[PDB]
Amino acid sequence: ARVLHMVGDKPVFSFQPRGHLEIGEKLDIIRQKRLSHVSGHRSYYLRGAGALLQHGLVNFTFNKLLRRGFTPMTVPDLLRGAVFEGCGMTPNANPSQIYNIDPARFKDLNLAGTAEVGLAGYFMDHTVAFRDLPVRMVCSSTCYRAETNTGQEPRGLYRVHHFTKVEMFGVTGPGLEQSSQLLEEFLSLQMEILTELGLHFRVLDMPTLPAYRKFDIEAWMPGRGRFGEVTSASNCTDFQSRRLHIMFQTEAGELQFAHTVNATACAVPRLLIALLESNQQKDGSVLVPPALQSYLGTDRITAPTHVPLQYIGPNQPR
Amino acid sequence: NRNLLYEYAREGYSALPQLDIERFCACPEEAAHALELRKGELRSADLPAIISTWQELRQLQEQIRSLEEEKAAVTEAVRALLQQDPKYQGLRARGREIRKELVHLYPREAQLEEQFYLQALKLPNQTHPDVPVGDESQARVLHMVGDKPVFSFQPRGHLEIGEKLDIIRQKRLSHVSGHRSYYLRGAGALLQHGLVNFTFNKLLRRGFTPMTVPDLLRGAVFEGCGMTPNANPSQIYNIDPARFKDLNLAGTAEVGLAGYFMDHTVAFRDLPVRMVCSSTCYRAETEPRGLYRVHHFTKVEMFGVTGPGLEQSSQLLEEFLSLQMEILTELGLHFRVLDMPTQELGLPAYRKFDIEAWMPGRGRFGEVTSASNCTDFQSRRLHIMFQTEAGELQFAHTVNATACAVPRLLIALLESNQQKDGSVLVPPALQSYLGTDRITAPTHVPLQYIGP
RNA sequence: GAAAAAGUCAUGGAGGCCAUGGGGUCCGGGCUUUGGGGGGUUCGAUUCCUUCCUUUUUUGC
Ligand SMILES: Nc1ncnc2c1ncn2[C@@H]1O[C@H](COS(=O)(=O)NC(=O)[C@@H](N)CO)[C@@H](O)[C@H]1O
Ligand SMILES: Nc1ncnc2c1ncn2[C@@H]1O[C@H](COS(=O)(=O)NC(=O)[C@@H](N)CO)[C@@H](O)[C@H]1O
């Protein structure tokens, strides 16, 4: 847990910065009230500029990586228990973070908690060529999580059950130096993306299970008043290969265990929290960064023209 | 067997569904004829029982209201008066008798209401006079765009083309993702993303509002949308009840949008409000191979809420169909628009319009997009009302269209743009997204299986 | 994700209607503030029991 770099500066305002939820509710871009029965507790409904922001953040990093050389791959969302246990996740226990499908309707079906398992299962019992290495693949998919932190910040978008994550998986050679260089490349790529978006972040090295090293990037949040993790790149030397029997064909032809590297490209919840709390204005407006201006189309976000949706349900004071 | 909507009404989560049974109660012949033509779950030999139960429930409700009125009047009299007074003793005895009668009649009325609502929620929606009658074979043809491409050789299957290009992997995926799974790679994923971005931009350019709905929704939204979450022959996924209770997977973005708009008014000046949402959809579905029938697939659905007039709803559905036709013409796909029959309309649909694209590799046409218009089914189920300039609330209409489906579109594109050598061309609209005028053989070497 | 506490302008008692502290209008005075939703005991329950929802305390990835 030691910081390595610090790029950017904290914004300056002449008033007390408001929270991301307050700004979203004022602009009507997101909604989180009266949704316990619709999509459970902790469930947001982005609309208007919120969806455009999510698409911009899911089509900016993807395109940037695609222009540097990347092999896109769409993974499934209903994985088996073998793939989950091979990664290092134990959904058998009760306090798990992987949604389990009803065993009466299906057998051994578990929801995909992240795109990392989906990208790892693609190479299950498959030998990759030597010349293809390094093989980098970006994947943007929806990730669900069973457990959330209700005691801390319950009414917020920080920790949500479902989100839209964009991961970057990488298969390298058997040498640790190659895996380390690939991890450094991924870290530099995500740092460049964050700098282009215009968000103040800090990269740190976590201390000390199956991962050999983990670099955590935490972005600044003026509204909350404390930094928050936005990404975490983990480097599993051979745990994934040893559990999933992932190998590669060397030049001589003998099978060897290949090194795997996984890193998160971008998370929509945290990116939108940082964008809403960083680009705050006096009248609740939100300035679009210089990179998403072409996608959003609006130089400065303003109040919505339409009337917000009222409530006509029984749970209301009459 | 139970109904989540009734449970919500009982617990106070939402108001009791305001069914329109009285609309046709005056003419049971027309309702029976419509039910027979639709041939839904409920038949024509069970409507009289439902009407009898509704009448009995109405009579019991009236008697209960009268008893409540008398009890309130005597209570008010006692309050205004305020022990040994004979009037006091008489009023106490009358109140005791009224309370006994009320407790005796309450369970009967509750059971009757439960049975009547469980038998009435199974009724289908109305049908448009222009909708042909019969099975899927009786599908009327409205428009036919494009023609079957001319091939100088036997066209190969979409699965074969994908395996050759190493863009779609489906072998040895049982232990990875169950059955009916796939792994799009390379140009396949690029084409999917390009198609999704193109459709999103085309929809946003015409005034639509982008949105994002969750994927794990409660069974109440499905029941209001006209689905069967818990059923023996069902096809909707369900999470483990031990981990989470009353949670189901979003079969389509329409369910999420309906849940979002549940119990929420909309401005008349803002109407008609349309919202497009792109997300993944899972379906149990329990052809034998290929991406034609898959469990998980990406899709963009457009949900529109318009005024109460049927002319407005019809014009909105027409606009949606025109937009879908223009999207298909822009992508360069030969398709035909068909009108679904009454036996395939569904429970909440009123006027469905399907689109079938030409699949040379498949050998026949295949459905790749559908659109439906529900006048008040969803509004009456989820209590999706809207206010007017005066301030009164009225049930609004709802139309749901499928902007695009990546599996069928990929199948059609791969089977239409194929070449003799093995390459697949790209339409003139997705060239900017794909960055390649044509899809050649992959540079990387395919993976080799070394497992048991 | 679990366990616990409060509950609607605020404090305190009161199942048959309140004291004090409050907000607004009119000439210190006067008018005036029905409690978040759905269920049980009761002749009547904002008050006794339970459930949904809002707020708060403990534990944990
Ligand atoms: N409950 C959650 N809700 C919303 N976003 C989350 C949640 N947990 C993690 N994230 C996002 O995912 C990022 C990675 O953290 S992580 O999920 O625990 N680790 C992974 O996903 C690994 N696949 C590393 O690539 C976080 O920085 C955050 O942006
Ligand atoms: N099991 C399935 N697997 C893959 N694609 C499917 C499947 N079922 C339907 N589709 C595709 O999705 C399109 C949507 O049409 S539909 O499911 O019948 N109707 C809806 O989803 C409603 N929400 C209104 O659009 C179909 O035309 C077809 O292209």
Numbering used by the authors:
A (entry chain A): 186 to 393, 398 to 507
B (entry chain B): 40 to 121, 130 to 333, 338 to 503
From the study:
To understand the molecular basis for mtRNASer(UGA) recognition in human mitochondria, we reconstituted the ternary complex between human mSerRS, the seryl-adenylate analogue 5’-O-[N-(L-seryl)sulfamoyl] adenosine (SerSA), and a stabilized mtRNASer(UGA) transcript, and determined its structure at 3.6 Å resolution using single-particle cryo-EM. Docked across the mSerRS dimer interface, mtRNASer(UGA) establishes interfaces with the active site entrance of subunit 1, the ‘C-tail’ and ‘N-helix’ of subunits 1 and 2, respectively, and the helical arm of subunit 2. Both active sites are occupied by a SerSA ligand, but only one of the two tRNA-binding sites is occupied by a tRNA. The mSerRS-bound mtRNASer(UGA) adopts a non-canonical L-shaped fold, with acceptor-stem-T-arm and anticodon-arm-D-arm domains arranged at an inter-domain angle of ~100°. However, in mtRNASer(UGA) the additional deletion of A9 in the linker between acceptor- and D-stem results in a shift of the entire D-stem by ~3.5 Å (one stacking plane) toward the T-arm. This allows G18 and G19 of the shortened D-loop to form a canonical elbow structure with the T-loop, consistent with earlier chemical probing and NMR data. Thus, mtRNASer(UGA) is bound almost exclusively through its acceptor-T-arm (‘minihelix’) domain, similar to the GCU isoacceptor. As for the mtRNASer(GCU) isoacceptor, mtRNASer(UGA) binding induces a large conformational rearrangement in the motif 2 loop in the entrance to the active site, which inserts residues 334-340 into the major groove of the acceptor stem and forms putative base-specific interactions with C74 of the CCA-end, ‘discriminator base’ (G73), and the first acceptor-stem pair G1:U72.
Animal mitochondrial gene expression relies on specific interactions between nuclear-encoded aminoacyl-tRNA synthetases and mitochondria-encoded tRNAs. In this study, we focus on the mitochondrial serylation system, in which a single nuclear-encoded enzyme, mSerRS, charges two distinct mitochondria-encoded mtRNASer isoacceptors. Both, mtRNASer(GCU) and mtRNASer(UGA) have lost the identity-defining long V-arm of the canonical cytosolic tRNASer, and each possesses an unusual secondary structure: While mtRNASer(UGA) adopts a non-canonical cloverleaf fold with extended anticodon stem, mtRNASer(GCU) lacks the entire D-arm33–35, making it the shortest and most degenerated of all human mtRNAs. In contrast to the principle of unimodality found among canonical aaRS-tRNA recognition systems, human mSerRS employs a bimodal recognition mechanism, in which it uses a single binding surface and substrate-specific induced fit to specifically recognize each mtRNASer isoacceptor by orthogonal sets of identity elements.
